């Protein structure tokens, strides 16, 4: 795997399908779509000190790795 | 033709002038004494009135508002400046 994280692991996927909106007022909404898709996380690149690595995902910067550079 | 049966009370409200204007254009006359023709007539009816009043047989007068029938139909503009000074004219 090379879209996992170092403190977590996330490669998910979905399907998608679109129709109408008018539902409490009118007939019902149409449904003519079904297409499989994919829904990626965020890439990051970082450097702190003697310059290693890490690729965390956009909300575990302020939560995750500042403890491990607080040792 | 739809609405030829209505009372006076519940009428156009402002169309009275249009109905009264046609009443005097029937009947055999020589001099007309009109006070504000074009009271509630908006623009399209006041365009209808301004095309006849320079094409008339006898003489007419009109004692009305300024600026749209004056210097287009008017020929002598009498004016009462002070108390009782009706001699004062405008426009020839």
């Amino acid at each position: 795997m090379k879209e996992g994280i170092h403190p977590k692991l996330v490669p998910a996927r979905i399907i998608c399908g679109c129709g109408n909106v008018i539902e409490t007022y009118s007939t019902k909404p149409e449904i003519y779509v079904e297409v499989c898709s994919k829904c990626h996380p965020f890439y990051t690149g970082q450097q702190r000190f003697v310059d290693t690595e890490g690729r965390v995902e956009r909300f575990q910067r302020r939560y995750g790795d500042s403890y491990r550079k607080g040792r | 033709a739809n609405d030829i049966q209505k009372n006076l009370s519940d009428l156009s409200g402002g169309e009275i002038i249009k109905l009264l204007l046609s009443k005097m254009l029937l009947g055999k006359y020589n001099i007309l004494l009109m006070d504000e023709p074009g009271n509630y007539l908006d623009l399209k009816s006041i365009a209808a009135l301004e095309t006849m009043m320079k094409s008339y047989a006898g003489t007419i007068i009109f004692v009305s508002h300024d600026k749209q029938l004056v210097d287009n139909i008017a020929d002598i503009i009498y004016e009462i400046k002070d108390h009782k000074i009706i001699k004062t004219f405008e426009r020839d």
Binding site: - | N2, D3, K6, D10, S12, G13, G14, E15, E36, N39, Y40, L41, D42, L43, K44, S45, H65, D66
Partner: protein, 199 residues
């Protein structure tokens, strides 16, 4: 700009044809809506309903702002105050009720129109029969007092000086667009150049 009225589902059939079409109307404060056009739209009939001249027996109107009124066909009964307040430099003063005829009482039937937090004006013709001095004595002071309106008239002399946006109904159309140049934006008849590039 809080609301006043939320009139909905208004329709009238006096002469067979529809006076008013199905709507859901709305007026709030800080507004100066003018009205225009037509010869038999009953814009004054319509005006009657907002004040409370009639009932419709179908509508579920609500109102909490109190209004004024100016009629279109009539005079008015006696309001004679001792040691007179703001009519000595305003239009006509105390006069007998036998001479009042013409552009003498239009300033008197609006002389009751300036009182008591009146929060809006429902006019139907302000400037009947009154000439140039009564114009500048109206428009100089009609713009004074704040609040929502709905003044309706027949020529854009003072209607360009005071109005921010203008309505026009053509069998109940509640189109709304910005005032002064309403006889200049009605060249959407020119986008009916189709029929001459489509046939």
């Amino acid at each position: 700009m809080s609301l006043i009225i939320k009139a909905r589902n208004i329709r009238l059939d006096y002469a067979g044809r529809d006076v008013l079409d199905i709507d859901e109307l709305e007026i709030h404060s800080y507004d100066r809506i003018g009205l225009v056009g037509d010869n038999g739209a009953g814009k004054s009939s319509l005006l009657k309903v907002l004040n409370g001249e009639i009932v419709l027996a179908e509508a579920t109107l609500q109102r909490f702002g109190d209004f004024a009124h100016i009629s279109q066909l009539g005079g008015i009964e006696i309001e004679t105050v001792e040691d007179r307040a703001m009519l000595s430099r305003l239009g006509v003063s105390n006069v007998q009720n036998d001479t009042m005829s013409g552009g003498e009482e239009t300033r008197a039937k609006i002389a009751a129109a300036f009182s008591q937090q009146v929060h809006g004006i429902l006019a139907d013709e302000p400037t009947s029969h009154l000439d140039l001095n009564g114009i500048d004595l109206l428009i100089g002071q009609l713009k004074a007092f704040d609040g929502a309106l709905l003044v309706i008239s027949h020529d854009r002399y003072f209607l360009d000086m005071v109005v921010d946006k203008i309505w026009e109904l053509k069998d109940g159309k509640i189109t709304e667009y910005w005032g002064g140049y309403s006889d200049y934006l009605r060249q959407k008849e020119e986008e009916r150049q189709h029929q001459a590039v489509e046939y």
